[PDB]
Write a protein that binds this ligand. Structure first.
Ligand code: MG
Ligand code: ZN
Ligand code: ZN
Ligand code: ZN
Lengths: 93, 98, 171, 84, 174, 64, 268, 105, 549
RNA sequence: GCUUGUGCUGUCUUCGUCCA
């Protein structure tokens, strides 16, 4: 599903179909993010039910996101080049 | 092992000409040795020492085995070639030109 | 120590409950999910004030799943211990390593290394107790202890007290 | 604050095609997940057809929140938007 | 589970010493700071509650909920059983027992007089609400005892602590 | 596991009578048999088959 | 370049930053699938033909409405209030002719894409209400005047009571109102189309409904649609022209291949 | 600019509706100066870094955004596409809420 | 519902805040320190701790679990480590920016060469945009070549002359006009010195330069500690049945770690400055080519085979890069492709689908009381008969593969479960032909299951697709949800696309022999007898049963 | 007494198919 097909689906106005194509029919992934630093550095043990961002030293302000696996890979490669992409779930102003 | 069948192989691990083959069926049986695990704790005849490296038929193809070649390579190990034959009849969607 | 706090909860409702009794069902679900819970950030939530007249607002339909998400804001009474605070307690169990007390729902453990030496543990006593010449502390006896450390769990709080300082011990 | 009072609503009073498609999809999904139906179905079984029947009779229990570019919004009921 | 009305608090570089919880230093953290905000965003003060005020509030709320659930038609056990959840029932039973066995003021009018004395007083206009709750809860008898139990009151020597304690003992039912 | 998997079989009834095949899948009575000449696999009930043995063709019941 | 451009619920065209690109999409707020080529009847012709087609004089007997097309043909001559209404209509038509001929279309072109096909609506009304036969019409002239005038103020592109909103709304429907007034003229309705009361009300309601249906829908991604609509002809295709000239235009090249001036001289 | 684009399009007899070319030249002249449809024109805007990097000069744009501590507000379609979210376009330009008042019937 | 339950609330991303990573943050988010170049412990499995494949960095194996989070390969995202560098090095992407900042400030007392007293500087301060603010400040302070000890009253200036700094390779040279002509000395500006100078810059001066105190600090452009990506970023491949080859990034990290140990040992034991310079330039080269191997004016880092090293930068750019190749467009599931054929007996919005494609593709239908009987009939039919089904999905998400189920006839369906039934008649599907020049290249059709292996189209839709039947192929996409099906059937359907917005005219018409025949049949001298008239009238689906006179 | 096994490389190069 190339870029031109994406533009055609934008021109149709079908946002739900585009989201389903690019996530459910493809690399859908779930990550946890700290609510303070906004980094994907949370250490989650789901069956032990314990979450922790060791850097920010917090256990309660943690959320889960559904993002493409390629987006996760891109953010990790950016982090490898010392760039800090921080994902926040609220606006500031 | 693979999900395909192995009953069409002979003792030497090679299929014989004249046999029907479907997709994924195994036509060349090959194994490579592997250092055995702690299964020497006792497994009389069922301890794994080999890993399967067999050649399956292409999943979209089927036909008859036409000829099986056996020889040795330049170095000196065995070397096999299997030829499959099938007939293709014209149908809707086939390309023709003048 | 008890406090009044403005709390919020996110409630997700399945489409099978989209009926006229949606508001009341959300209220009872909120009550069952809030009353008696223990969160380390806040402490212990004991009751919710005005529990039958809480505004729930309009729920937002989650895209791709149909279920509605509600933001419910409420005021509740919350209790949380603090480091270096002196509170009363009631002894619940006696052990050679120390005694276990109860401060409401919170259970506080005090080790012998935070107990004065004259309060020697007597296991032969009926019931077993940490007793001195003029003091006798056993199960059900009023004790005043100072909280030194607090341990936070996933949905539990563990507190450690001490009675080695003045104006503590038996009361 | 961001909400706009019902008397001074200035957006179009007609249901756009995107809103119609999204409302039909959401209602069909809810019906397929065992939500109560508000219209009498004669012999219909398909959730999308039941949702379309609900829309034609103005019985869909959903609200459309239209967002303005500055951040404010207007709330419109599915029963007060004209559908062709 | 439940989320406070205070949000944001993103990453920075500076570290402060007023971050650890400590009753003695009167550092209650951001979520229990002296300044709070309601659902409307207006200014709001931290609301401490003594055991008398807390007991009155929990009894009032519980009896209101019990009356509402019964169609508008006193025992602690039945009132605790009104609530739902076995762990919730145990927690409210433990709180009811703790409050009952340490209730300094079981009367509404006595609690009202105590709150008015501890709020409208000129000396108490500077007192932190946590200090007020601790004084009304612990039932101290001496200035030295109160200072030892509550180290924050040591730095506030402009408070008529002894006469306030004697008034509290007088209001306390023997 | 059925005793008829990967065994040469002959069809005795229906529209494919007298065609030699090999049993590939056998779950509940609907044996999947590949046909030697038509490059295809067809479903067939166990009643319509004839399993080869050392002494001529045997029916399904008389073999299992 | 155009991917993030969308029509919003206030009618404006904006990008992802909220910067306004157009205060109304297409300067008329219409969908690109809802317009057809129509002729504006006040633009072409001579002054004699325009006067003959549109002017109705109730004093001169040979330059009035015909007597076999109206049942009220007797008590019509000599009226002054009705003559004032007809004069107001004619002055509005003359203003429209001046506006279109002098500001909008100066070369006389009058076949332009507009919404709501009026010819189709008129012939549909004629077929539905059986407007054949020499039967006189019961449609009074003030009814025609007030119906057309009210119709020309219900074509809502923008909603609101602000004065700027009203000015933008009046601006957005100028050409379409000119088309409607040129078609639904009193003499034309009475003689060429021969509508009656029911047919007239049906035509007015149909025009209003179809104009409401021709507006662009908020949420449209008109930027991507414009990009595809411009790039698609480029796929199937001494002054440089074609793809190199399109590249020069889109890159804003400083040194184009064939610079040129178009110099116009004074009349003499 | 509209006249030149119209000349180029209409020379070979083709026809394009006015609104498309009007939107194009309005984007090309909205900033007060001529903005070319190139990386020098498009990527010198105030749009989000994630939206600009997906066109051209990805790594340079990301390095500049990191060094400048840029904040992407994720309002564009490209950011939501590459984050796997419902883009605020078409059917995603509004929210759907549950009507409790109507449900009483 | 394909992910295991988590008590963390589910939210979406509203803002992305960019910035640089500080050494404190790199150390804090790390789970292990990497100091051993050897990948394998003793060539006997169980990779060495503290190495580049430490088991705390994450698990990329089926049977092994991550020792940091305890999750399996499918769920573990990977964890970062760090690698302390013996000497600081330049970040290859920020060297011109470091040069410009060095021009902007004073190399001895870390202060801007000009203050707000200059009105032009105040105007440069006023602009909010950090890039333009930095540009203006740089355009001003570049001219100023001397720190001012007193105000042009002491501004704190040390008075020293500002050198001219020129870039060559990755090395900056600062030419001081030491005290008309004299002998000027150009000395190397080592990364440690610039780092120390940047560290003294006040926060307010940092803000004046367009940097941010919290997220983008000027001394963080110098690498003192290197974050180590998890194995998920740099997976190993299986070259043959036995030997497995390491990723390029792993080899480059091994080279970096060897150079670091070399620098450290050299400094500790004995220090001839020339050898220090050589080995430290080798370390700088390795760190620079680990991130950017397309550096102009110097040779590329090569593999043992002679192919150049694949750097991180080259993973993110081009058609096959991360952005264009895996985010703006990707490969998707639930799709089909085959040759297309014409069908005069199909409706305009219908598509003919081969039976094998209908068996392969599926739609997950929710079990309700309106369809439970039909769905259990489909489940009884199985995955090899049409109409059948392939999977039964429980509420908890467990799939039941109907191929390998011995009691598929004894499966009872509960309300709320999902059945992945085969593609059926009248299911909406999206149909597409490349290149997709306009939005009529993707339209939603209705499925009709037919024999033979081609897709079938009405001939009037061949114009918007620009397709013919001499070998063309077209793609098909199956929606997987009720909302997505409604979107396809109400927005993208073929009848809704008849009139295009490009030229406000139809894009579909009567074509080819239908056009020729309609011209021939409507000629004035064409007459038809009663029997043929009856046949043609019965051929009309919309005919009302009344024969005309 | 006897029970059916559960998956796949990477990187280049060349030749082709349908548009353009
Ligand atoms: Mg072709
Ligand atoms: Zn964090
Ligand atoms: Zn892990
Ligand atoms: Zn200086």
């Amino acid at each position: 599903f190339g870029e031109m097909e994406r533009d055609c689906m934008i021109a149709h106005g079908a946002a739900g179909f585009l989201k389903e194509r690019l996530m459910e029919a493809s690399d859908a992934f779930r990550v946890h993010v700290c609510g303070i630093c906004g980094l994907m550095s949370v250490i989650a043990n789901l069956k032990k039910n314990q979450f922790e961002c060791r850097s920010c030293k917090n256990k309660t302000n943690i959320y889960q996101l559904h993002i493409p696996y390629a987006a996760k890979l891109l953010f990790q490669e950016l982090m490898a080049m010392n760039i800090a992409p921080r994902l926040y779930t609220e606006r500031s102003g | 092992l693979k999900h395909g069948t192995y009953e069409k192989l002979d003792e030497d691990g090679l299929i014989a000409p004249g046999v029907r083959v479907s997709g994924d069926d195994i036509i060349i049986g090959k194994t490579t040795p592997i250092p055995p695990d702690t299964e020497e704790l006792g497994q009389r005849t069922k301890y794994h020492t080999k890993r399967d490296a067999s050649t399956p038929l292409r999943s979209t193809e089927n036909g008859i085995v036409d000829q099986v070649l056996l020889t040795t390579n330049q170095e000196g190990l065995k070397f096999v070639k299997v030829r499959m034959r099938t007939t293709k009849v014209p149908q809707i969607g086939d390309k023709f030109a003048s | 120590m008890f406090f009044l706090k403005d709390l919020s909860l996110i409630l997700t409702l399945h489409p099978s409950y989209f009926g006229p009794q949606m508001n009341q069902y959300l209220r009872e679900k909120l009550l069952t999910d809030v009353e008696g819970t223990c969160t380390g950030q806040f402490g212990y939530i004991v009751t919710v004030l005005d529990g039958m007249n809480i505004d729930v607002g309009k729920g937002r339909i989650i895209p791709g799943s149909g279920s509605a998400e509600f933001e419910v804001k409420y005021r509740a009474v919350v209790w949380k211990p603090f480091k270096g605070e002196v509170v009363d307690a009631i002894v619940s169990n006696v052990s050679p390593i120390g005694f276990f007390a109860d401060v409401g729902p919170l259970n506080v453990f005090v080790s012998t290394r935070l107990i004065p030496d004259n309060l020697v543990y007597n296991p032969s006593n009926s019931p077993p107790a940490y007793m001195s010449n003029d003091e006798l502390i056993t199960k059900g006896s009023k004790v005043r202890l100072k909280v030194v450390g607090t341990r936070t769990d996933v949905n539990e709080i563990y507190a450690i007290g001490s009675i080695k300082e003045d104006f503590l011990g038996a009361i | 604050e961001l909400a706009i009072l019902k008397e001074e609503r200035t957006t179009t009073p007609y249901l756009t095609k995107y809103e119609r498609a999204r409302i039909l999809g959401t209602r069909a999904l809810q019906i397929s997940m065992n939500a109560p139906v508000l219209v009498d179905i004669e012999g219909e079984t398909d959730p999308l057809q039941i949702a379309m029947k609900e829309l034609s009779q103005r019985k869909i229990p959903l609200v459309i929140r239209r967002y303005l570019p500055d951040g404010s919004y207007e709330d419109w009921g599915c029963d007060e938007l004209i559908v062709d | 589970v439940s989320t406070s009305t205070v949000g944001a608090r993103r990453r920075r570089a500076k570290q402060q010493v007023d971050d650890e919880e400590n009753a003695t230093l009167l550092r209650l953290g951001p979520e229990f700071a002296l300044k709070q905000y309601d659902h409307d965003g207006n200014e709001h003060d931290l609301i401490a509650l003594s055991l008398s005020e807390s007991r009155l509030l929990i009894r009032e709320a519980l009896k209101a909920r019990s009356r509402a659930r019964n169609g508008g038609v006193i025992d602690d056990d039945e009132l605790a059983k009104v609530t739902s959840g076995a762990v919730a029932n145990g927690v409210v039973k433990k709180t009811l027992d703790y409050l009952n066995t340490f209730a300094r003021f079981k009367d509404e009018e006595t609690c009202t007089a105590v709150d008015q004395l501890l709020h409208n007083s000129s000396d108490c206009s500077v007192l932190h609400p946590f200090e007020i709750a601790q004084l009304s809860s612990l039932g101290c008898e001496d200035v030295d005892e109160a200072i030892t139990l509550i180290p924050s009151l040591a730095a506030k020597k402009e408070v008529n602590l002894q006469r306030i304690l004697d008034e509290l003992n007088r209001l306390e039912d023997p | 596991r059925d005793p008829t998997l990967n065994k040469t079989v002959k069809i005795r009834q229906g529209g494919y009578k007298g065609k030699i095949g090999i049993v590939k899948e056998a779950n509940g009575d609907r044996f999947r048999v590949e046909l030697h000449n038509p490059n295809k696999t067809i479903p067939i009930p166990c009643s319509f088959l004839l399993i080869e043995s050392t002494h001529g063709w045997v029916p399904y019941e008389d073999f299992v | 370049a155009l991917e993030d451009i969308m029509v919003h619920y206030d009618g404006t065209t904006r990008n992802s930053l909220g910067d306004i690109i157009q205060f109304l999409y297409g300067e008329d707020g219409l969908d690109g699938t809802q317009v057809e080529r129509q002729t504006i009847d006040t633009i072409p012709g001579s002054d004699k033909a325009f006067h003959k087609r549109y002017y109705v004089d109730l004093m001169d007997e040979k330059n009035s409405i015909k007597p076999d097309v109206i049942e009220y043909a007797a008590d019509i001559l000599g009226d002054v209030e009705l003559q004032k209404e007809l004069n107001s209509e004619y002055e509005q038509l003359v203003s429209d002719r001046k506006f279109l001929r002098e500001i909008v279309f100066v070369n006389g072109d009058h076949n332009w894409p507009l919404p709501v096909n009026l010819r189709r609506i008129i012939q549909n009304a004629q077929q539905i209400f059986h407007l054949d036969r020499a039967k006189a019409s019961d449609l009074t002239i003030p009814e025609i005047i007030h119906g057309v005038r009210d119709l020309c103020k219900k074509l809502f592109v923008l909603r609101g009571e602000n004065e700027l909103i009203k000015e933008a709304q009046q601006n957005a429907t100028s050409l379409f109102q000119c088309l409607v007034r040129a078609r639904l003229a009193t003499r034309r309705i009475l003689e060429e189309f021969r509508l009656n009361r029911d047919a007239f009300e049906w035509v007015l309601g149909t025009i209003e409904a179809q104009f409401q249906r021709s507006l662009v829908h908020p949420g449209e991604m008109v930027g991507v649609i414009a990009a595809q609509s411009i790039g698609e002809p480029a796929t199937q295709m001494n002054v440089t022209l074609g793809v190199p000239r399109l590249k020069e235009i889109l890159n804003v090249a400083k040194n184009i291949k064939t610079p040129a001036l178009t110099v116009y001289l004074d009349r003499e | 600019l509209y006249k030149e684009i119209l000349n180029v399009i209409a020379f070979d007899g083709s026809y394009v509706n006015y609104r498309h070319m009007a939107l194009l030249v309005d984007v090309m002249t909205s900033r007060g100066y001529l903005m070319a449809i190139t990386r020098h024109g498009i990527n010198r805007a105030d749009t989000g870094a994630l939206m600009r990097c997906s066109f051209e000069e990805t790594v340079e744009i990301l390095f500049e955004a990191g060094a400048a501590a840029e904040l992407d507000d994720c309002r564009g379609v490209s950011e939501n596409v590459m984050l796997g979210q419902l883009a605020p376009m078409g059917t995603g330009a509004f929210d759907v809420m549950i009507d409790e008042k109507l449900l009483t019937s | 519902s394909q992910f295991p339950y988590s008590s963390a609330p589910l939210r979406s991303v509203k803002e992305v805040q960019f910035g640089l990573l500080s050494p404190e943050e790199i150390r804090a988010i790390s789970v292990v320190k990497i100091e051993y170049p050897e990948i394998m412990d003793e060539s006997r499995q169980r990779p060495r701790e503290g190495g580049l494949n430490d088991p705390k960095l994450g698990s990329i194996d089926r049977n092994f679990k991550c020792q940091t989070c305890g999750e399996g390969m499918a769920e573990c995202p990977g964890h970062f480590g760090h690698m302390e560098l013996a000497k600081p090095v330049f970040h290859i992407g920020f060297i011109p920016k470091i040069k410009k900042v060095c021009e902007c400030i004073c190399m001895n007392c870390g202060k801007l060469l000009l203050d707000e007293t200059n009105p032009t500087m105040a105007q440069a301060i006023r602009i909010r945009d950090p890039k333009k603010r930095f540009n203006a400040v740089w355009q001003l302070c570049k001219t100023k070549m001397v720190c001012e000890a007193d105000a042009p009253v002491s501004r704190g200036g040390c008075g020293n002359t500002q050198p001219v700094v020129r870039k060559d390779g990755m090395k900056l040279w600062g030419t001081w006009k030491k005290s008309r002509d004299a002998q000027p000395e150009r000395k190397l500006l080592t990364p440690g010195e610039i780092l120390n100078v940047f560290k003294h810059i006040s926060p307010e001066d940092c803000f004046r330069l367009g940097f941010n105190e919290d997220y983008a600090r000027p001394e963080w452009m110098i690498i003192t500690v290197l974050p180590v990506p998890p194995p998920q970023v740099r997976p190993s491949i299986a070259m043959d049945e036995t030997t497995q080859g390491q990723d390029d990034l792993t080899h480059k990290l091994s080279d970096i770690l060897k150079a670091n140990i070399n620098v450290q040992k050299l400094e500790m034991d004995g220090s001839p400055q020339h050898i220090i310079n050589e080995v430290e330039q080798l370390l700088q080269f390795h760190v620079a080519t680990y991130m950017d191997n397309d550096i102009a004016g110097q040779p590329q880092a090569l593999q043992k085979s002679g192919r150049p090293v694949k750097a991180i930068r080259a993973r993110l750019k081009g058609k096959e890069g991360r952005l264009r190749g895996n985010l703006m467009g990707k490969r998707v599931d639930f799709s089909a492709r085959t040759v297309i054929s014409g069908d005069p007996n199909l409706e305009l919005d219908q598509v003919g689908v081969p039976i094998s494609i209908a068996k392969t593709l599926s739609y997950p239908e929710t079990v309700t009381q309106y369809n439970i009987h039909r769905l259990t009939e489909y489940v009884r039919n199985g995955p090899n008969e049409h109409p059948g089904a392939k999977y039964v999905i429980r509420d908890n998400g467990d799939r039941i593969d109907l191929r390998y189920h011995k009691r598929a006839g004894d499966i009872v369906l509960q309300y709320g479960w999902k059945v992945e039934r085969h593609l059926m008649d009248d299911d909406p599907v999206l149909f597409n032909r490349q290149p997709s020049l306009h939005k009529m290249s993707m339209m939603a059709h209705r499925v009709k299951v037919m024999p033979y292996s081609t897709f079938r189209l009405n001939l009037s839709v061949t114009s918007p697709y620009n397709a013919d039947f001499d070998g063309d192929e077209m793609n098909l996409h199956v929606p997987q949800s009720e909302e997505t099906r409604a979107e396809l059937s109400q927005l993208c359907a073929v009848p809704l696309q008849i009139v295009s917005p490009q030229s406000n005219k139809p894009v579909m018409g009567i074509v080819q022999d239908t056009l020729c025949g309609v011209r021939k049949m409507t000629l004035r001298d064409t007459f038809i007898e009663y029997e043929q008239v009856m046949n043609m009238l019965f051929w009309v689906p919309s005919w009302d049963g009344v024969v005309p006179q």
